Short mmCIF file of all heavy atoms in Angstrom, two decimals:
data_model
loop_
_atom_site.label_atom_id
_atom_site.label_comp_id
_atom_site.label_asym_id
_atom_site.label_seq_id
_atom_site.Cartn_x
_atom_site.Cartn_y
_atom_site.Cartn_z
N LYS I 261 106.77 74.78 110.07
CA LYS I 261 107.75 74.20 109.19
C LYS I 261 108.87 75.20 108.86
O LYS I 261 110.16 74.87 108.99
CB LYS I 261 107.18 73.71 107.83
CG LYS I 261 106.21 72.63 108.09
CD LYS I 261 106.88 71.34 108.35
CE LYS I 261 105.89 70.35 109.03
NZ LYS I 261 106.29 68.79 108.95
N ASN I 262 108.50 76.36 108.42
CA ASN I 262 109.47 77.51 108.19
C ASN I 262 108.85 78.82 108.50
O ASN I 262 107.62 78.96 108.49
CB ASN I 262 109.96 77.48 106.79
CG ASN I 262 110.87 76.28 106.34
OD1 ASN I 262 110.50 75.58 105.53
ND2 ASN I 262 112.00 76.16 106.99
N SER I 263 109.74 79.83 108.78
CA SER I 263 109.24 81.18 108.98
C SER I 263 110.07 82.27 108.20
O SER I 263 111.13 81.89 107.67
CB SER I 263 109.19 81.60 110.44
OG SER I 263 110.55 81.63 111.00
N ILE I 264 109.60 83.41 108.04
CA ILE I 264 110.36 84.50 107.58
C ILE I 264 109.89 85.75 108.28
O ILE I 264 108.65 86.07 108.10
CB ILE I 264 110.11 84.79 106.05
CG1 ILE I 264 110.68 83.63 105.27
CG2 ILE I 264 110.75 86.00 105.58
CD1 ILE I 264 110.61 83.80 103.77
N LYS I 265 110.66 86.42 109.08
CA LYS I 265 110.15 87.54 109.82
C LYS I 265 110.12 88.75 108.86
O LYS I 265 110.96 88.78 107.98
CB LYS I 265 111.01 87.94 111.13
CG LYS I 265 110.56 87.05 112.37
CD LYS I 265 110.87 87.67 113.76
CE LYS I 265 110.58 86.65 114.91
NZ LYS I 265 110.95 87.11 116.34
N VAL I 266 109.12 89.64 109.01
CA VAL I 266 108.92 90.76 108.14
C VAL I 266 110.15 91.69 108.16
O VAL I 266 110.45 92.38 107.19
CB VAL I 266 107.69 91.57 108.51
CG1 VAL I 266 107.63 92.88 107.70
CG2 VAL I 266 106.40 90.74 108.24
N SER I 267 110.86 91.62 109.29
CA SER I 267 112.08 92.34 109.44
C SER I 267 113.20 92.01 108.40
O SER I 267 114.16 92.73 108.26
CB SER I 267 112.68 92.14 110.85
OG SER I 267 113.92 92.64 110.96
N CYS I 268 113.12 90.81 107.78
CA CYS I 268 114.05 90.46 106.68
C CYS I 268 113.40 89.90 105.47
O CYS I 268 113.97 89.15 104.66
CB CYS I 268 115.11 89.45 107.18
SG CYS I 268 114.57 88.43 108.61
N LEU I 269 112.08 90.30 105.26
CA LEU I 269 111.30 89.76 104.22
C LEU I 269 111.65 90.45 102.84
O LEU I 269 111.97 91.63 102.81
CB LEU I 269 109.82 89.99 104.46
CG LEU I 269 108.88 89.40 103.46
CD1 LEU I 269 109.22 87.94 103.19
CD2 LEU I 269 107.48 89.67 104.03
N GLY I 270 111.46 89.68 101.75
CA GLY I 270 111.56 90.25 100.48
C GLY I 270 110.68 89.58 99.50
O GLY I 270 110.34 88.43 99.71
N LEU I 271 110.36 90.29 98.37
CA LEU I 271 109.24 89.83 97.56
C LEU I 271 109.55 90.18 96.06
O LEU I 271 109.95 91.26 95.81
CB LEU I 271 107.97 90.48 97.95
CG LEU I 271 106.89 90.57 96.83
CD1 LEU I 271 106.37 89.21 96.52
CD2 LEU I 271 105.83 91.50 97.43
N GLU I 272 109.28 89.15 95.19
CA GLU I 272 109.43 89.33 93.80
C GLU I 272 108.19 88.70 93.18
O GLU I 272 108.08 87.47 93.24
CB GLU I 272 110.71 88.69 93.29
CG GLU I 272 110.92 88.76 91.74
CD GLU I 272 112.14 87.86 91.42
OE1 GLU I 272 113.19 87.96 92.23
OE2 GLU I 272 112.21 87.22 90.35
N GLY I 273 107.29 89.47 92.60
CA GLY I 273 106.00 88.98 92.19
C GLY I 273 105.85 88.74 90.70
O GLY I 273 106.62 89.20 89.88
N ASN I 274 104.92 87.87 90.35
CA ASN I 274 104.62 87.52 89.03
C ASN I 274 105.77 86.71 88.33
O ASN I 274 106.00 86.91 87.11
CB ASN I 274 104.13 88.63 88.18
CG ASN I 274 103.02 89.44 88.70
OD1 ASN I 274 101.81 88.95 88.55
ND2 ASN I 274 103.25 90.60 89.36
N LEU I 275 106.48 85.92 89.11
CA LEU I 275 107.63 85.16 88.73
C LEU I 275 107.59 84.83 87.23
O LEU I 275 106.68 84.35 86.71
CB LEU I 275 107.78 83.97 89.51
CG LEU I 275 108.85 83.79 90.69
CD1 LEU I 275 109.54 82.49 90.63
CD2 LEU I 275 109.91 84.93 90.58
N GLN I 276 108.71 85.04 86.56
CA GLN I 276 108.87 84.70 85.16
C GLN I 276 107.51 84.66 84.51
O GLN I 276 107.09 83.62 83.99
CB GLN I 276 109.64 83.35 85.02
CG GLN I 276 111.13 83.44 85.49
CD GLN I 276 112.16 83.79 84.35
OE1 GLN I 276 112.27 83.15 83.41
NE2 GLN I 276 112.95 84.89 84.61
N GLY I 277 106.76 85.76 84.61
CA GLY I 277 105.54 85.94 83.83
C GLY I 277 104.22 85.63 84.54
O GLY I 277 103.17 86.27 84.25
N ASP I 278 104.25 84.62 85.36
CA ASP I 278 103.10 83.91 85.88
C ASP I 278 102.35 84.75 87.03
O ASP I 278 102.98 85.11 87.94
CB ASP I 278 103.51 82.58 86.47
CG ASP I 278 102.25 81.66 86.67
OD1 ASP I 278 101.42 81.91 87.53
OD2 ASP I 278 102.25 80.67 85.88
N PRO I 279 101.10 85.04 86.81
CA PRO I 279 100.27 85.78 87.78
C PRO I 279 100.15 84.94 89.12
O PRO I 279 100.10 85.65 90.23
CB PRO I 279 98.88 85.87 87.16
CG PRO I 279 99.11 85.70 85.77
CD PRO I 279 100.22 84.78 85.56
N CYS I 280 100.08 83.64 89.03
CA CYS I 280 99.91 82.82 90.25
C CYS I 280 101.14 82.56 91.11
O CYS I 280 101.08 82.02 92.19
CB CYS I 280 99.26 81.51 89.83
SG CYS I 280 97.51 81.28 90.41
N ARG I 281 102.31 82.89 90.60
CA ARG I 281 103.55 82.58 91.24
C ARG I 281 104.33 83.87 91.69
O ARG I 281 104.41 84.86 91.00
CB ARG I 281 104.51 81.80 90.37
CG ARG I 281 103.84 80.36 90.06
CD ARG I 281 104.54 79.68 88.90
NE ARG I 281 105.88 79.13 89.29
CZ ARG I 281 107.04 79.51 88.83
NH1 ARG I 281 107.21 80.51 88.03
NH2 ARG I 281 108.16 78.86 89.31
N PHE I 282 104.78 83.83 92.94
CA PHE I 282 105.61 84.86 93.52
C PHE I 282 106.72 84.15 94.36
O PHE I 282 106.59 82.94 94.62
CB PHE I 282 104.96 85.95 94.28
CG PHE I 282 104.15 85.50 95.44
CD1 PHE I 282 104.68 85.59 96.75
CD2 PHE I 282 102.88 85.00 95.29
CE1 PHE I 282 103.98 85.20 97.86
CE2 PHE I 282 102.12 84.55 96.46
CZ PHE I 282 102.72 84.65 97.70
N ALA I 283 107.61 84.92 94.93
CA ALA I 283 108.71 84.43 95.76
C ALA I 283 108.87 85.27 97.00
O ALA I 283 108.75 86.49 96.86
CB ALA I 283 110.06 84.31 95.00
N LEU I 284 109.15 84.68 98.08
CA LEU I 284 109.38 85.41 99.31
C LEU I 284 110.78 85.05 99.79
O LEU I 284 111.21 83.87 99.75
CB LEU I 284 108.34 85.09 100.42
CG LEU I 284 106.97 85.39 100.04
CD1 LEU I 284 106.08 84.97 101.17
CD2 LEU I 284 106.83 86.90 99.75
N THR I 285 111.58 86.06 100.21
CA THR I 285 112.99 85.88 100.44
C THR I 285 113.37 86.38 101.80
O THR I 285 112.87 87.36 102.26
CB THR I 285 113.81 86.66 99.33
OG1 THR I 285 115.12 86.18 99.29
CG2 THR I 285 113.96 88.12 99.65
N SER I 286 114.23 85.61 102.50
CA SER I 286 114.65 85.91 103.77
C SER I 286 116.15 86.18 103.78
O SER I 286 116.89 85.34 103.68
CB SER I 286 114.36 84.88 104.80
OG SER I 286 115.25 84.97 105.93
N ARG I 287 116.57 87.46 103.87
CA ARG I 287 117.96 87.84 103.89
C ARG I 287 118.25 88.56 105.20
O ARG I 287 117.83 89.65 105.41
CB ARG I 287 118.25 88.76 102.69
CG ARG I 287 119.78 89.05 102.43
CD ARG I 287 120.01 90.05 101.24
NE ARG I 287 120.34 89.28 99.99
CZ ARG I 287 119.46 88.92 99.04
NH1 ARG I 287 118.18 89.18 99.20
NH2 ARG I 287 119.90 88.29 97.93
N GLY I 288 119.03 87.82 106.13
CA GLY I 288 119.27 88.35 107.45
C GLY I 288 120.67 88.82 107.65
O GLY I 288 121.58 88.60 106.85
N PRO I 289 120.91 89.53 108.87
CA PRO I 289 122.30 90.04 109.24
C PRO I 289 123.25 88.95 109.66
O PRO I 289 124.40 88.96 109.35
CB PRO I 289 121.97 90.96 110.40
CG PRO I 289 120.72 90.48 110.97
CD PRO I 289 119.90 89.84 109.87
N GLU I 290 122.68 87.92 110.33
CA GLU I 290 123.48 86.83 110.92
C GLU I 290 123.20 85.44 110.14
O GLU I 290 124.17 84.66 110.08
CB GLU I 290 123.10 86.78 112.43
CG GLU I 290 122.93 88.14 113.04
CD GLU I 290 123.02 88.10 114.67
OE1 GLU I 290 123.35 87.07 115.19
OE2 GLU I 290 122.73 89.12 115.27
N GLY I 291 122.00 85.24 109.72
CA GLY I 291 121.64 84.00 109.08
C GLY I 291 121.96 84.05 107.52
O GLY I 291 122.41 85.07 106.98
N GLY I 292 121.82 82.90 106.88
CA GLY I 292 121.96 82.74 105.40
C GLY I 292 120.84 83.36 104.66
O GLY I 292 120.02 84.14 105.17
N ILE I 293 120.70 82.97 103.33
CA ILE I 293 119.69 83.49 102.48
C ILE I 293 118.74 82.43 101.97
O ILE I 293 119.15 81.58 101.19
CB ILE I 293 120.28 84.19 101.17
CG1 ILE I 293 121.55 85.00 101.61
CG2 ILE I 293 119.35 85.27 100.68
CD1 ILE I 293 122.28 85.78 100.51
#
């Protein structure tokens, strides 16, 4: 369905307080965000 290569991976954990929620972000040189 979707991918994120570790080469452009990003992470922000414990989203707005919650232990069970985090976010993974893909920011590339040629692609969008």
